[PDB]
Amino acid sequence: KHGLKEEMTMKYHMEGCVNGHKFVITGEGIGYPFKGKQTINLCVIEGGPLPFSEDILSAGF
Amino acid sequence: SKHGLKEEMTMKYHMEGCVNGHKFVITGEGIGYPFKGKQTINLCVIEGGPLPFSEDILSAGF
Amino acid sequence: SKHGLKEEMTMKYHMEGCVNGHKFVITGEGIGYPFKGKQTINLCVIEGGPLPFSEDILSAGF
Amino acid sequence: KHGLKEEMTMKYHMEGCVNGHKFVITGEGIGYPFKGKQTINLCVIEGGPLPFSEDILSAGF
Amino acid sequence: DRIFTEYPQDIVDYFKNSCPAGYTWGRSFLFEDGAVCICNVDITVSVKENCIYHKSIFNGVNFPADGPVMKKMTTNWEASCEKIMPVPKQGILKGDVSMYLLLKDGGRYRCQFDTVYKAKSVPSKMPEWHFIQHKLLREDRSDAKNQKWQLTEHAIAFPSAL
Amino acid sequence: DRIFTEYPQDIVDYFKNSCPAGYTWGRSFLFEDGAVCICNVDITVSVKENCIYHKSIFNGVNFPADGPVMKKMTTNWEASCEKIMPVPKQGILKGDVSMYLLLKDGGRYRCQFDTVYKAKSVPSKMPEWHFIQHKLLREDRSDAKNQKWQLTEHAIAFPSAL
Amino acid sequence: DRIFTEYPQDIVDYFKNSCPAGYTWGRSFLFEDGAVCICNVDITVSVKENCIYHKSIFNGVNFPADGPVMKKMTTNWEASCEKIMPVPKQGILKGDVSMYLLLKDGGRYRCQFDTVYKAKSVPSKMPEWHFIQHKLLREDRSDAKNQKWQLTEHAIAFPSAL
Amino acid sequence: DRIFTEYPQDIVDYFKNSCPAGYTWGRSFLFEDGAVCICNVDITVSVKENCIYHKSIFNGVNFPADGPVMKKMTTNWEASCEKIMPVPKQGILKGDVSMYLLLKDGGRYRCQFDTVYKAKSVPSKMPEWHFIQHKLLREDRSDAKNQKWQLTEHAIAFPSAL
């Protein structure tokens, strides 16, 4: 319904700049839109390693 | 112990205040059920009425 | 007119307060030059001393 | 002194996104670093016309 | 008064535990139109009277003349969900809830609450952080001779739902 | 992505309803120590692939050099309760949640989220204000070559409990 | 007290004009560590005594136990520059200054001030917005029997410098 | 660009001193109606060209749809007084200024700027806290084809006047 199934695949592309440090991150995931559950693996493709905690980005994907 | 608490209890209220420089005094009486989390209080403005502002801002004060 | 003002004047101060629930009372006397923008005041804690907090937070109060 | 003269030329390149609208702006200017005066002309090269007031960007260049 | 909170078995009741001596609290109110209120409260139990005494100091500044408070455009606070966190070394709790005042037009008037709850005696046992949901309704009973009104409040404390 | 939220039948699911075309949001982050982040996201459903695309811009400034973020002192976001309110005439939603980042010392670090959820399609049904409860965990799985980590979420929409 | 402000010819003195009846003001204090103070003041001139009476209500909550205020780590406010703006229809002024408390270690403790100045009678003439620069110094004169101290304040009102 | 600031001889000019290599800054904007903008800038001096290069990223969210920004109700920033403080151990500066945008109705719209000025070179001399006064005017010169406008600034650094 509305293009969604019970299991679905996800894709993330973040362009950012924190405290002047420019970075890029991509990730893939699996999630159950009706169980309100999702699990994503992220990998920094530019600006690795990050000069800040990974936590501030979590709600960003 | 019971920390001096009952299922049904009584409550009294004295509020002294000033809001946009307008001074006021409110007292109240109430009945409450501490373990059920239910209170009902009645308030009377005894000095500085009628309040130039909404009673709603004081509700979380009492 | 002169709005009841002089070059040299006197000032008196009553502060009633509560800070982190600690109640206190301060009065003061001062000398001032309203047109020069210069005041000098002396304050005494008369109830609730010694203050558990810094006097600095009250300075802009008086 | 420190690479500055009394008259100097300036160049601006802003990449932005306001309220989901993506835009790009460039500008040139003339300024007197010792007189604390500067005058800049800006031109939107992407996302013209802007859906918001020009004022919010002023301190951005 | 967080004595009037239904607590489950699984969460320590700091407030009932503070009795009969009782607790004090300070709260800041930050309204979205830049008004600021402060409230201090002292709560004691009279075990002789089965009566909970509330002494309250409430102060407010910078309510805009033609804003919803000085224009009496409020009806009620919307039901809320406050977060309650223990401050481990100070033996006290902190309370944070974003509150909304319903306007008669159908609008919404935001006010940030940040409270500090202090038992009069060192609690032997502190709660872990939790929620308390609140529903608080008012009814003006004002007559020509007096300004009066009624409040009802229903509070329940919850842990994290998952 | 607020599509990964279990909605009960009686609360209108704005996010799932927006699909597959999807929706956009902007969020401000205000940290207790003055840092400010903004995030913009574009979520679109390719039904061909059975896949959800996220395109995010993320900017932040004025994190103190020796702060817990720059020094990486953070373990996880504490479990939260977000307030989702409708915006009646604009056909959009507004997130308001107070968030805590747990410091490895056992303390907290506060951030205010203010989100605007805005569907690409003009929506038929608008939800009534309700709550969403989230639990978000992180595990770093960094190797010699790349920096990588896993996230897991669980979100459930609720009405007031009273 | 903004009666003790040196005003130039070119700017209307709202404060001296309010005398001898006088003016009232409310101020919010927002400290960067989340403490919040409120101050109301009533100022009257006794023309008989050549004495300016100050009646002051001051309240504060949520000063952290191990922060610079409850630990007495302050020495003085840093010299400031307040902006004074007329509210045309209300016949009142608003005052905004970001204030800094110097710590003994050499540090800095920020507090936002937002004031409202109200003459007791409708001013016939209102100022245009301006600045007032302030220098305010304290000297503790406390003895064993009493807590006492001295303040000196020097204020001058300026227009825009360019 | 804080290089276009007249500095007197007795205040250390951090910005001109940073040149020609230049400096970077980040700024948060907090508007009274909840919108939040961030800006990052990289200023470099090509001495070959006698020219100053600016590279800016600018992001902002949650401007109300019918707000003065989205509806273009703004004429100019009101003239201001910024407080530039050093950060002793990090060799950087911190801007703090309260800004007003004049509405075409004759009213105001407030924004808080918090800037971090950070030179590319480790600086020899650090300034003492001082003030900068700015006047910034805008003229729209939009035609049929492109959207264009002119800005003019004037900034002067000052110590306290007392």
Side-chain angles (χ1 to χ4, degrees):
Chain A
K1 181 172 177 217
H2 303 292
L4 307 162
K5 311 217 76 48
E6 294 233 76
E7 179 150 27
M8 288 196 80
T9 154
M10 287 90 71
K11 262 153 125 196
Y12 308 90
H13 179 91
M14 191 184 284
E15 247 197 348
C17 182
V18 175
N19 266 42
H21 195 81
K22 245 122 136 166
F23 59 92
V24 169
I25 292 157
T26 77
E28 85 247 322
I30 296 186
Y32 307 86
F34 305 102
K35 270 164 199 138
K37 304 205 213 213
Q38 80 189 300
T39 293
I40 71 146
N41 283 275
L42 289 146
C43 173
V44 194
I45 69 103
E46 273 185 58
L50 290 184
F52 54 79
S53 161
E54 300 162 344
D55 276 311
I56 65 154
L57 304 181
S58 307
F61 293 111
Chain B
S1 60
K2 321 179 39 177
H3 306 274
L5 299 169
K6 256 73 133 152
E7 278 263 89
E8 179 164 80
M9 300 200 48
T10 255
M11 302 101 69
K12 254 179 276 192
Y13 297 92
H14 194 103
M15 182 181 280
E16 258 232 338
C18 185
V19 164
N20 282 18
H22 177 97
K23 264 161 174 130
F24 61 80
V25 173
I26 299 158
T27 57
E29 30 106 357
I31 326 85
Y33 308 91
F35 300 91
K36 303 215 187 77
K38 286 181 183 132
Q39 41 181 347
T40 300
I41 87 169
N42 296 275
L43 296 157
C44 198
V45 179
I46 58 156
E47 301 181 46
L51 289 186
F53 57 95
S54 161
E55 311 154 338
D56 266 325
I57 82 183
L58 310 163
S59 304
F62 274 103
Chain C
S1 60
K2 321 179 39 177
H3 306 274
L5 299 169
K6 256 73 133 152
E7 278 263 89
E8 179 164 80
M9 300 200 48
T10 255
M11 302 101 69
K12 254 179 276 192
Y13 297 92
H14 194 103
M15 182 181 280
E16 258 232 338
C18 185
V19 164
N20 282 18
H22 177 97
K23 264 161 174 130
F24 61 80
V25 173
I26 299 158
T27 57
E29 30 106 357
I31 326 85
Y33 308 91
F35 300 91
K36 303 215 187 77
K38 286 181 183 132
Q39 41 181 347
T40 300
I41 87 169
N42 296 275
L43 296 157
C44 198
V45 179
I46 58 156
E47 301 181 46
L51 289 186
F53 57 95
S54 161
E55 311 154 338
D56 266 325
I57 82 183
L58 310 163
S59 304
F62 274 103
Chain D
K1 181 172 177 217
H2 303 292
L4 307 162
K5 311 217 76 48
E6 294 233 76
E7 179 150 27
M8 288 196 80
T9 154
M10 287 90 71
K11 262 153 125 196
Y12 308 90
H13 179 91
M14 191 184 284
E15 247 197 348
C17 182
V18 175
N19 266 42
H21 195 81
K22 245 122 136 166
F23 59 92
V24 169
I25 292 157
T26 77
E28 85 247 322
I30 296 186
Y32 307 86
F34 305 102
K35 270 164 199 138
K37 304 205 213 213
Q38 80 189 300
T39 293
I40 71 146
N41 283 275
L42 289 146
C43 173
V44 194
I45 69 103
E46 273 185 58
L50 290 184
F52 54 79
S53 161
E54 300 162 344
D55 276 311
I56 65 154
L57 304 181
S58 307
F61 293 111
Chain E
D1 189 356
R2 290 280 63 73
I3 286 166
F4 301 95
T5 311
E6 178 175 298
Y7 267 74
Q9 283 309 111
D10 36 295
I11 307 169
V12 174
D13 198 326
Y14 185 93
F15 302 108
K16 285 186 194 74
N17 276 340
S18 76
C19 296
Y23 72 93
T24 50
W25 61 260
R27 176 173 299 153
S28 47
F29 306 78
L30 299 173
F31 302 77
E32 71 191 35
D33 62 350
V36 182
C37 297
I38 300 303
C39 201
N40 258 297
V41 184
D42 181 338
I43 306 159
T44 316
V45 195
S46 187
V47 175
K48 263 168 129 57
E49 303 173 31
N50 197 44
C51 185
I52 301 158
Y53 277 94
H54 300 72
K55 235 222 196 158
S56 169
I57 299 295
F58 189 108
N59 292 289
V61 292
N62 305 335
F63 283 106
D66 294 307
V69 176
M70 299 316 271
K71 279 325 210 174
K72 291 149 187 219
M73 290 293 296
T74 56
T75 80
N76 274 298
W77 296 97
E78 202 170 73
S80 58
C81 182
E82 175 183 20
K83 180 140 164 169
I84 302 284
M85 305 143 270
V87 192
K89 279 132 110 279
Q90 289 349 287
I92 57 181
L93 313 175
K94 236 143 83 103
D96 150 33
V97 49
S98 193
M99 292 285 285
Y100 289 95
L101 249 178
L102 274 39
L103 300 175
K104 316 207 229 218
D105 64 44
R108 202 186 279 270
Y109 178 57
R110 194 178 148 169
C111 181
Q112 180 59 24
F113 286 14
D114 303 271
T115 321
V116 172
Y117 306 95
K118 223 226 184 276
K120 289 173 176 166
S121 302
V122 259
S124 127
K125 300 289 129 201
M126 293 279 281
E128 283 165 319
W129 81 265
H130 54 266
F131 290 117
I132 296 172
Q133 295 195 40
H134 309 263
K135 172 154 234 185
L136 160 41
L137 298 174
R138 159 175 72 72
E139 278 169 356
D140 187 80
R141 306 265 218 238
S142 281
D143 69 57
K145 290 318 219 82
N146 275 98
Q147 202 190 276
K148 299 122 61 105
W149 69 92
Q150 192 181 65
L151 293 175
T152 74
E153 196 229 38
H154 188 23
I156 298 152
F158 301 90
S160 187
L162 40 67
Chain F
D1 195 356
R2 268 289 74 55
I3 290 165
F4 295 87
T5 305
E6 179 180 336
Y7 263 78
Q9 308 246 304
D10 51 6
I11 312 193
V12 168
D13 192 350
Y14 179 98
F15 308 104
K16 285 197 193 55
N17 279 9
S18 83
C19 291
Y23 67 105
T24 69
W25 55 264
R27 179 174 288 150
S28 65
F29 310 66
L30 309 187
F31 302 86
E32 63 169 55
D33 69 2
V36 181
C37 300
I38 287 156
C39 194
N40 256 289
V41 193
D42 173 280
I43 289 115
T44 310
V45 175
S46 171
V47 212
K48 257 153 129 44
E49 299 161 35
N50 188 38
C51 187
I52 312 190
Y53 281 65
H54 312 66
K55 275 276 181 167
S56 147
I57 300 160
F58 188 111
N59 298 275
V61 290
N62 305 2
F63 282 106
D66 292 31
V69 170
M70 295 317 287
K71 289 313 212 150
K72 301 178 156 86
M73 280 308 101
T74 67
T75 293
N76 273 306
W77 290 102
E78 199 166 70
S80 60
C81 182
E82 182 175 3
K83 185 142 178 179
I84 295 322
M85 298 145 291
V87 180
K89 263 184 76 196
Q90 305 284 353
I92 54 138
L93 307 189
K94 239 164 87 113
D96 162 12
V97 58
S98 194
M99 293 279 287
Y100 294 84
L101 204 16
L102 312 184
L103 302 169
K104 316 244 162 132
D105 80 16
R108 283 148 204 287
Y109 179 59
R110 199 172 153 184
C111 182
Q112 190 65 10
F113 294 20
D114 288 308
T115 327
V116 180
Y117 301 93
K118 144 191 24 182
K120 292 158 171 178
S121 14
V122 195
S124 300
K125 322 196 294 287
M126 283 296 271
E128 277 155 358
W129 86 262
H130 55 277
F131 292 115
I132 288 148
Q133 273 192 53
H134 340 242
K135 179 196 245 284
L136 164 67
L137 300 172
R138 152 168 95 69
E139 207 190 337
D140 180 283
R141 297 193 195 294
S142 288
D143 59 78
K145 309 85 150 202
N146 293 349
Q147 192 189 349
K148 297 135 125 308
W149 66 95
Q150 202 184 68
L151 295 183
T152 75
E153 233 242 289
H154 189 16
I156 299 156
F158 297 105
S160 20
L162 320 129
Chain G
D1 189 356
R2 290 280 63 73
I3 286 166
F4 301 95
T5 311
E6 178 175 298
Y7 267 74
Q9 283 309 111
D10 36 295
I11 307 169
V12 174
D13 198 326
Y14 185 93
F15 302 108
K16 285 186 194 74
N17 276 340
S18 76
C19 296
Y23 72 93
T24 50
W25 61 260
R27 176 173 299 153
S28 47
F29 306 78
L30 299 173
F31 302 77
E32 71 191 35
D33 62 350
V36 182
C37 297
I38 300 303
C39 201
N40 258 297
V41 184
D42 181 338
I43 306 159
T44 316
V45 195
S46 187
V47 175
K48 263 168 129 57
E49 303 173 31
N50 197 44
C51 185
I52 301 158
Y53 277 94
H54 300 72
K55 235 222 196 158
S56 169
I57 299 295
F58 189 108
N59 292 289
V61 292
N62 305 335
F63 283 106
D66 294 307
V69 176
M70 299 316 271
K71 279 325 210 174
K72 291 149 187 219
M73 290 293 296
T74 56
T75 80
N76 274 298
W77 296 97
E78 202 170 73
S80 58
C81 182
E82 175 183 20
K83 180 140 164 169
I84 302 284
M85 305 143 270
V87 192
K89 279 132 110 279
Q90 289 349 287
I92 57 181
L93 313 175
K94 236 143 83 103
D96 150 33
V97 49
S98 193
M99 292 285 285
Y100 289 95
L101 249 178
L102 274 39
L103 300 175
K104 316 207 229 218
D105 64 44
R108 202 186 279 270
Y109 178 57
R110 194 178 148 169
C111 181
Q112 180 59 24
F113 286 14
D114 303 271
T115 321
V116 172
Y117 306 95
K118 223 226 184 276
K120 289 173 176 166
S121 302
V122 259
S124 127
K125 300 289 129 201
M126 293 279 281
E128 283 165 319
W129 81 265
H130 54 266
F131 290 117
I132 296 172
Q133 295 195 40
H134 309 263
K135 172 154 234 185
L136 160 41
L137 298 174
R138 159 175 72 72
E139 278 169 356
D140 187 80
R141 306 265 218 238
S142 281
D143 69 57
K145 290 318 219 82
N146 275 98
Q147 202 190 276
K148 299 122 61 105
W149 69 92
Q150 192 181 65
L151 293 175
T152 74
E153 196 229 38
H154 188 23
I156 298 152
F158 301 90
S160 187
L162 40 67
Chain H
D1 195 356
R2 268 289 74 55
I3 290 165
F4 295 87
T5 305
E6 179 180 336
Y7 263 78
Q9 308 246 304
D10 51 6
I11 312 193
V12 168
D13 192 350
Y14 179 98
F15 308 104
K16 285 197 193 55
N17 279 9
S18 83
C19 291
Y23 67 105
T24 69
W25 55 264
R27 179 174 288 150
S28 65
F29 310 66
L30 309 187
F31 302 86
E32 63 169 55
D33 69 2
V36 181
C37 300
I38 287 156
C39 194
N40 256 289
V41 193
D42 173 280
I43 289 115
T44 310
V45 175
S46 171
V47 212
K48 257 153 129 44
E49 299 161 35
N50 188 38
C51 187
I52 312 190
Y53 281 65
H54 312 66
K55 275 276 181 167
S56 147
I57 300 160
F58 188 111
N59 298 275
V61 290
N62 305 2
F63 282 106
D66 292 31
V69 170
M70 295 317 287
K71 289 313 212 150
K72 301 178 156 86
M73 280 308 101
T74 67
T75 293
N76 273 306
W77 290 102
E78 199 166 70
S80 60
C81 182
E82 182 175 3
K83 185 142 178 179
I84 295 322
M85 298 145 291
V87 180
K89 263 184 76 196
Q90 305 284 353
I92 54 138
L93 307 189
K94 239 164 87 113
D96 162 12
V97 58
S98 194
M99 293 279 287
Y100 294 84
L101 204 16
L102 312 184
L103 302 169
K104 316 244 162 132
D105 80 16
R108 283 148 204 287
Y109 179 59
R110 199 172 153 184
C111 182
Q112 190 65 10
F113 294 20
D114 288 308
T115 327
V116 180
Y117 301 93
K118 144 191 24 182
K120 292 158 171 178
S121 14
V122 195
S124 300
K125 322 196 294 287
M126 283 296 271
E128 277 155 358
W129 86 262
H130 55 277
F131 292 115
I132 288 148
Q133 273 192 53
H134 340 242
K135 179 196 245 284
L136 164 67
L137 300 172
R138 152 168 95 69
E139 207 190 337
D140 180 283
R141 297 193 195 294
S142 288
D143 59 78
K145 309 85 150 202
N146 293 349
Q147 192 189 349
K148 297 135 125 308
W149 66 95
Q150 202 184 68
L151 295 183
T152 75
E153 233 242 289
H154 189 16
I156 299 156
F158 297 105
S160 20
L162 320 129

